[PDB]
């Protein structure tokens, strides 16, 4: 599995995702060491969180709005 | 030989390298096989023996794809010469009637065993030869007996021997199927005066002899052109005098004295009904059990009557 | 793509090829097409690589040479137009319209 | 030299290889033949030049392309069909069948990304993930993680080079590497004051580099003995690592 | 939106280019500045093969060779949307402006020295 | 200061009139039909003309501005007119009529596999 996220850096629509990733990385490669994480993106996108499944096997959810601690269930609800 | 992906193209000049040499060509047949054959970029050796005959091939495509060669079946080298640089070669050859030069043997059975040995000698992929419906080894047309010779001998050398072996054709100026109907003074053969079998017609032949000449697997196969649905006789005459002239006027003549006109026809300046044509009156398809067709090369040959409309249709009264 | 051949024709006078792809190949150059013909179609270009060595170098003793290449019968110019070469080097004896050489002596 | 004469010539907008830059170049075609290429304007990436290999890649285009698939029976080496060469791709995958952890692809030299997307996501298709570099044994993560871009690549500015006040390169000669960079190496150290050195390959380039060793110890020597006072003490520096 | 006059299938298939004509580096002088330019690309299995006979290239784009000349880019793209394409716009570089005091030869305490 | 087959070029506002004009014109279209099979001798039927004017007429259903209508109107009628006499020629005329299948051979299945 390998798990992939793009953030906008405009303040709206991406400070939770901005203050989630500013602390949760050291959460997820020392949750899931063999799981690969990237985030790559800075310009004007929407926020959506992609994980991929081992075998060919995409999924997604978009991550609208909360402060934070809902973007990491919505997260863990991508693992399920 | 090998090559790239299939065979049907969307453009002229799209062209594909393939080098094909058609025997004959300058009559019947081998019009249609190489109007399909330069249309999508092929060279054609077209080699031939009338200098006027040959012009009308020339406009199927625009360069290097049409090509003129001096060959005589008499001469070794000059077949020889025609197929050194060939990747594959058909030869539609042998005439309906012997000339004042020619047996029926060695018009499709020596004739075809120098050209052969050409191909031999040349190691070229993919001979096909056609022969004729009914080939058999059996006397009573002696046309038959030497297609079936021919068949022979083409299996005899060169295991890439693809016959096919077409069914009474049907297309634009049919020699002797629909220019006895269409011209017709008086067509008055056939003793038995029914009992023909199976029209194809001449571009579905072309279709067949094209999907054939280009893909693999297909070496030492031979093909038998099925008619698609009908195998009719000649009350198709009838359908051919649905056309309101209905001047078709058979008169069932008796067998030996409808000779002397055959044995007339050697004396003529013109071919005009030569006795194997009168033989094979007799015979119907034997259609063989066992030979590939438009189903297992993927086509589906046209029927007879709703073409027919189309391919007679100067000849009306008003 | 085959085997055959008919020994009747190099590349020019000159033996080998004239310039930087220029092949003399017949059966890349299609040898489909060359039947029944005589092979005295035009092979006439000389291959001017072998006319600078029919040309002798010429001399002059100043420092730069005119070259022209016109006639002295033509009432009209006619020659390369007028380039100025230095013979300073041996070995730039090139004039770049027509191939004659001058040497400084 | 006198191939072409510029009215004969697509000039076609194209972007450069060879080079990590992505430098501006421009190709001029005759059509199938490739003639010359000329470095198009483009202010910020390497604003009026090119790369001299990347001058000429024309005649090494047109020399010995590979036209056809080819297939070995074994050091006997025959062009074959386009789909024959597909279906004994196929069939010899049958024949390993190599499912878990293995077929390894490998990211070549000079490609598109979207030939290395199909490729990823055909091998995660296939089904496992092996994909490394050309790198000799760099079969393992470039110790920066793909995680948070600005850590992997250039992250300054290339213009924003000749507004460095000191940089140092380590484990490079970028006249080796990305010329044109080098050359907004030299239009900075021209027009401003640096303090530059390089740390690790011994290299001529024309801007007085002061080299500090080819080891790594001589490296931490060097961070924690001056530079630590340079870099913190100048304004904007930069810090530039070889591949 | 049909086309009205445009008897290909060409508002459907092919990927057209906008782009400001670049600034040549060989000759100095700027008139291809001033355009704006549709070209239709050669994303083809046409795209101008070899002939065999002669040796030109004989291409199989019927429209292989045209260019507009435009004025504005949003008239430009006004347009292509108006006879309806899938076009890609590509924005131009200017070059930037840096001051050249001709004096620019003289120095203090300073290794490198130029013409 | 003549005409044909009475020609007139003048559009009007309303969709509502511009659909009776185009299905007053579809009506001639379709009527001369065995006049075309007359004058042209094609091989195929009358029905297949027939089917083949409505798919030319189904082919722009849905086109919106009454403002392209009127020259798609104009193409309509205008071609009628350049087929309602000789001014057509059987070769030009056979531009409109994909008939035959086997001039192409085993081609495209429009899959991904055979564009190679
Ligand atoms: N009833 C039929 O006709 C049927 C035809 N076939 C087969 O189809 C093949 C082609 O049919 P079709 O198109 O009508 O053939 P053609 O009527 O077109 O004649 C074949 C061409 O080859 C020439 N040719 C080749 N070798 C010789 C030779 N030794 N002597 C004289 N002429 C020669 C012929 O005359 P020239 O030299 O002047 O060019 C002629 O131009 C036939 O050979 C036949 O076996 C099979 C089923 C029915
Ligand atoms: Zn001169």
Same mark, same amino acid.
């Given at each position: 599995?390998?798990?992939?996220?793009?953030?906008?850096?405009?303040?709206?629509?991406?400070?939770?995702?901005?203050?989630?990733?500013?602390?949760?990385?050291?959460?997820?490669?020392?949750?899931?060491?063999?799981?690969?994480?990237?985030?790559?993106?800075?310009?004007?996108?929407?926020?959506?969180?992609?994980?991929?499944?081992?075998?060919?096997?995409?999924?997604?959810?978009?991550?609208?709005?909360?402060?934070?601690?809902?973007?990491?269930?919505?997260?863990?609800?991508?693992?399920? | 030989?090998?090559?790239?992906?299939?065979?049907?193209?969307?453009?002229?000049?799209?062209?594909?390298?393939?080098?094909?040499?058609?025997?004959?060509?300058?009559?019947?047949?081998?019009?249609?096989?190489?109007?399909?054959?330069?249309?999508?970029?092929?060279?054609?050796?077209?080699?031939?023996?009338?200098?006027?005959?040959?012009?009308?091939?020339?406009?199927?495509?625009?360069?290097?794809?049409?090509?003129?060669?001096?060959?005589?079946?008499? @001469?070794?080298?000059?077949?020889?010469?025609?197929?050194?640089?060939?990747?594959?070669?058909?030869?539609?050859?042998?005439?309906?009637?012997?000339?004042? @030069?020619?047996?029926?043997?060695?018009?499709?059975?020596?004739?075809?065993?120098?050209?052969?040995?050409?191909?031999?000698?040349?190691?070229?992929?993919?001979?096909?030869?056609?022969?004729?419906? @009914?080939?058999?080894?059996?006397?009573?047309?002696?046309? @038959?007996?030497?297609?079936?010779?021919?068949?022979?001998?083409?299996?005899?050398?060169?295991?890439?021997?693809?016959?096919?072996?077409?069914?009474?054709?049907?297309?634009?100026?049919?020699?002797?199927?629909?220019?006895?109907?269409?011209?017709?003074?008086?067509?008055?053969?056939?003793?038995?005066?029914?009992?023909?079998?199976?029209?194809?017609?001449?571009?579905?032949?072309?279709?067949?002899?094209?999907?054939?000449?280009?893909?693999?697997?297909?070496?030492?196969?031979?093909?038998?052109?099925?008619?698609?649905?009908?195998?009719?006789?000649?009350?198709?005459?009838?359908?051919?005098?649905?056309?309101?002239?209905?001047?078709?006027?058979?008169?069932?003549?008796?067998?030996?004295?409808?000779?002397?006109?055959?044995?007339?026809?050697?004396?003529?300046?013109?071919?005009?009904?030569?006795?194997?044509?009168?033989?094979?009156?007799?015979?119907?398809?034997?259609?063989?059990?066992?030979?590939?067709?438009?189903?297992?090369?993927?086509?589906?040959?046209?029927?007879?009557?709703?073409?027919?409309?189309?391919?007679?249709?100067?000849?009306?009264?008003? | 793509?085959?085997?055959?051949?008919?020994?009747?024709?190099?590349?020019?006078?000159?033996?080998?090829?004239?310039?930087?792809?220029?092949?003399?190949?017949? *059966?890349?150059?299609?040898?489909?097409?060359?039947?029944?013909?005589?092979?005295?179609?035009?092979?006439?270009? *000389?291959?001017?690589?072998?006319?600078?060595?029919?040309?002798?170098?010429?001399?002059?003793?100043?420092?730069?040479?005119?070259?022209?290449?016109?006639?002295?019968?033509?009432?009209?110019?006619?020659?390369?137009?007028?380039?100025?070469?230095?013979?300073?080097?041996?070995?730039?004896?090139?004039?770049? *319209?027509?191939?004659?050489? *001058?040497?400084?002596? | 030299?006198?191939?072409?004469?510029?009215?004969?010539?697509?000039?076609?907008?194209?972007?450069?290889?060879?080079?990590?830059?992505?430098?501006?170049?421009?190709?001029?075609?005759?059509?199938?033949?490739?003639?010359?290429?000329?470095?198009?304007?483009?202010? =910020?990436?390497?604003?009026?030049?090119?790369? =001299?290999?990347?001058?000429?890649?024309?005649?090494?285009?047109?020399?010995?392309?590979?036209?056809?698939?080819?297939?070995?029976?074994?050091?006997?080496?025959?062009?074959?069909?386009?789909?024959?060469?597909?279906?004994?791709?196929?069939?010899?995958?049958?024949?390993?069948?190599?499912?878990?952890?293995?077929?390894?692809?490998?990211?070549?030299?000079?490609?598109?990304?979207?030939?290395?997307?199909?490729?990823?996501?055909?091998?995660?298709?296939?089904?496992?993930?092996?994909?490394?570099?050309?790198?000799?044994?760099?079969?393992?993560?470039?110790?920066?993680?793909?995680?948070?871009?600005?850590?992997?690549?250039?992250?300054?500015?290339?213009?924003?080079?000749?507004?460095?006040?000191?940089?140092?390169?380590?484990?490079?000669?970028?006249?080796?590497?990305?010329?044109?960079?080098?050359?907004?190496?030299?239009?900075?150290?021209?027009?401003?004051?640096?303090?530059?050195?390089?740390?690790?390959?011994?290299?001529?380039?024309?801007?007085?580099?002061?080299?500090?060793?080819?080891?790594?110890? =001589?490296?931490?020597?060097?961070?924690?003995?001056?530079?630590?006072?340079?870099?913190?003490?100048?304004?904007?520096?930069?810090?530039?690592?070889?591949? | 939106?049909?086309?009205?006059?445009?008897?290909?299938?060409?508002?459907?298939?092919?990927?057209?280019?906008?782009? !400001? !004509?670049?600034?040549?580096?060989? %000759?100095?002088?700027?008139?291809?500045?001033?355009?704006?330019?549709?070209?239709?690309?050669?994303?083809?299995?046409?795209?101008?093969?070899?002939?065999?006979?002669?040796?030109?290239?004989?291409?199989?784009?019927?429209?292989?060779?045209?260019?507009?000349?435009?004025?504005?880019?949003?008239?430009?793209?006004?347009?292509?949307?108006?006879?309806?394409?899938?076009?890609?716009?590509?924005?131009?570089?200017?070059?930037?402006?840096?001051?050249? %005091?001709?004096?620019?030869?003289?120095?203090?305490?300073?290794?490198?020295?130029?013409? | 200061?003549?005409?044909?087959?009475?020609?007139?070029?003048?559009?009007?506002?309303?969709?509502?009139?511009? /659909?009776?004009?185009?299905?007053?014109?579809?009506?001639?279209?379709?009527?001369?039909?065995?006049?075309?099979?007359?004058?042209? #001798?094609? /091989?195929?039927?009358?029905?297949?003309?027939?089917?083949?004017?409505?798919? #030319?007429?189904?082919?722009?259903?849905?086109?919106?501005?009454?403002?392209?209508?009127?020259?798609?109107?104009?193409?309509?009628?205008?071609?009628?007119? #350049?087929?309602? $006499?000789?001014?057509?020629? /059987?070769?030009?005329?056979?531009?409109?009529?994909? #008939?035959?299948?086997?001039?192409?051979?085993?081609?495209?299945?429009? $899959?991904?596999?055979?564009?190679?």
């Amino acid at each position: 599995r390998e798990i992939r996220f793009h953030l906008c850096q405009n303040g709206s629509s991406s400070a939770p995702l901005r203050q989630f990733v500013k602390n949760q990385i050291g959460a997820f490669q020392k949750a899931n060491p063999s799981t690969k994480v990237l985030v790559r993106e800075a310009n004007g996108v929407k926020p959506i969180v992609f994980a991929r499944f081992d075998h060919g096997h995409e999924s997604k959810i978009g991550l609208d709005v909360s402060s934070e601690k809902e973007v990491a269930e919505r997260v863990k609800s991508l693992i399920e | 030989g090998k090559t790239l992906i299939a065979k049907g193209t969307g453009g002229r000049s799209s062209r594909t390298g393939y080098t094909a040499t058609v025997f004959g060509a300058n009559g019947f047949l081998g019009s249609y096989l190489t109007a399909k054959l330069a249309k999508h970029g092929t060279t054609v050796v077209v080699p031939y023996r009338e200098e006027m005959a040959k012009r009308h091939l020339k406009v199927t495509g625009d360069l290097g794809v049409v090509n003129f060669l001096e060959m005589d079946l008499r @001469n070794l080298e000059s077949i020889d010469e025609a197929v050194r640089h060939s990747d594959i070669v058909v030869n539609l050859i042998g005439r309906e009637y012997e000339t004042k @030069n020619f047996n029926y043997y060695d018009v499709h059975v020596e004739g075809a065993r120098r050209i052969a040995e050409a191909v031999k000698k040349h190691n070229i992929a993919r001979y096909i030869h056609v022969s004729a419906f @009914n080939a058999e080894i059996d006397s009573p047309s002696e046309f @038959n007996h030497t297609k079936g010779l021919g068949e022979q001998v083409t299996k005899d050398i060169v295991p890439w021997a693809t016959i096919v072996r077409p069914a009474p054709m049907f297309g634009r100026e049919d020699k002797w199927f629909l220019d006895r109907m269409a011209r017709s003074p008086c067509l008055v053969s056939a003793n038995k005066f029914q009992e023909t079998s199976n029209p194809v017609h001449v571009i579905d032949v072309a279709a067949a002899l094209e999907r054939i000449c280009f893909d693999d697997s297909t070496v030492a196969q031979t093909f038998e052109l099925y008619g698609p649905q009908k195998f009719t006789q000649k009350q198709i005459i009838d359908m051919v005098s649905e056309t309101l002239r209905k001047e078709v006027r058979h008169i069932e003549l008796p067998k030996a004295l409808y000779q002397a006109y055959t044995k007339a026809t050697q004396a003529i300046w013109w071919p005009t009904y030569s006795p194997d044509q009168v033989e094979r009156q007799f015979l119907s398809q034997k259609i063989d059990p066992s030979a590939k067709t438009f189903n297992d090369l993927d086509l589906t040959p046209m029927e007879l009557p709703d073409l027919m409309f189309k391919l007679i249709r100067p000849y009306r009264v008003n | 793509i085959p085997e055959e051949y008919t020994k009747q024709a190099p590349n020019r006078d000159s033996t080998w090829a004239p310039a930087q792809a220029s092949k003399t190949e017949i *059966y890349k150059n299609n040898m489909v097409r060359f039947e029944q013909k005589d092979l005295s179609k035009q092979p006439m270009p *000389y291959a001017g690589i072998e006319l600078i060595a029919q040309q002798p170098v010429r001399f002059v003793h100043g420092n730069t040479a005119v070259c022209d290449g016109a006639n002295h019968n033509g009432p009209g110019a006619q020659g390369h137009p007028k380039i100025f070469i230095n013979v300073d080097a041996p070995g730039s004896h090139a004039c770049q *319209y027509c191939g004659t050489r *001058y040497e400084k002596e | 030299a006198f191939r072409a004469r510029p009215w004969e010539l697509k000039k076609t907008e194209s972007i450069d290889v060879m080079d990590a830059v992505g430098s501006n170049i421009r190709i001029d075609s005759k059509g199938v033949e490739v003639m010359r290429v000329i470095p198009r304007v483009h202010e =910020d990436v390497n604003e009026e030049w090119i790369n =001299d290999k990347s001058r000429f890649a024309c005649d090494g285009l047109k020399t010995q392309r590979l036209t056809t698939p080819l297939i070995r029976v074994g050091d006997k080496f025959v062009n074959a069909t386009w789909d024959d060469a597909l279906s004994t791709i196929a069939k010899a995958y049958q024949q390993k069948a190599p499912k878990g952890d293995e077929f390894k692809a490998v990211a070549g030299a000079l490609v598109e990304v979207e030939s290395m997307v199909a490729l990823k996501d055909m091998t995660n298709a296939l089904g496992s993930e092996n994909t490394t570099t050309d790198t000799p044994n760099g079969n393992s993560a470039p110790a920066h993680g793909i995680t948070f871009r600005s850590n992997y690549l250039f992250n300054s500015s290339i213009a924003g080079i000749e507004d460095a006040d000191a940089i140092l390169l380590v484990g490079t000669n970028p006249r080796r590497e990305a010329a044109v960079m080098n050359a907004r190496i030299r239009k900075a150290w021209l027009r401003q004051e640096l303090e530059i050195a390089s740390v690790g390959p011994t290299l001529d380039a024309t801007f007085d580099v002061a080299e500090l060793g080819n080891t790594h110890a =001589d490296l931490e020597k060097a961070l924690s003995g001056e530079f630590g006072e340079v870099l913190k003490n100048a304004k904007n520096p930069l810090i530039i690592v070889g591949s | 939106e049909i086309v009205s006059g445009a008897p290909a299938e060409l508002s459907r298939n092919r990927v057209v280019r906008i782009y !400001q !004509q670049a600034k040549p580096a060989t %000759q100095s002088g700027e008139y291809g500045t001033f355009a704006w330019r549709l070209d239709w690309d050669i994303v083809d299995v046409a795209n101008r093969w070899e002939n065999d006979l002669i040796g030109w290239q004989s291409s199989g784009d019927y429209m292989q060779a045209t260019q507009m000349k435009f004025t504005s880019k949003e008239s430009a793209i006004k347009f292509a949307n108006k006879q309806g394409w899938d076009f890609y716009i590509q924005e131009p570089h200017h070059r930037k402006f840096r001051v050249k %005091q001709y004096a620019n030869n003289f120095v203090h305490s300073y290794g490198k020295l130029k013409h | 200061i003549a005409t044909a087959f009475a020609e007139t070029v003048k559009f009007s506002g309303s969709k509502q009139e511009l /659909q009776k004009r185009t299905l007053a014109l579809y009506r001639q279209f379709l009527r001369g039909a065995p006049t075309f099979a007359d004058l042209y #001798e094609v /091989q195929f039927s009358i029905p297949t003309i027939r089917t083949k004017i409505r798919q #030319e007429f189904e082919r722009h259903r849905f086109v919106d501005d009454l403002s392209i209508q009127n020259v798609l109107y104009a193409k309509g009628h205008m071609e009628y007119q #350049e087929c309602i $006499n000789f001014w057509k020629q /059987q070769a030009q005329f056979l531009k409109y009529f994909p #008939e035959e299948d086997d001039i192409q051979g085993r081609h495209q299945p429009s $899959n991904f596999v055979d564009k190679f």
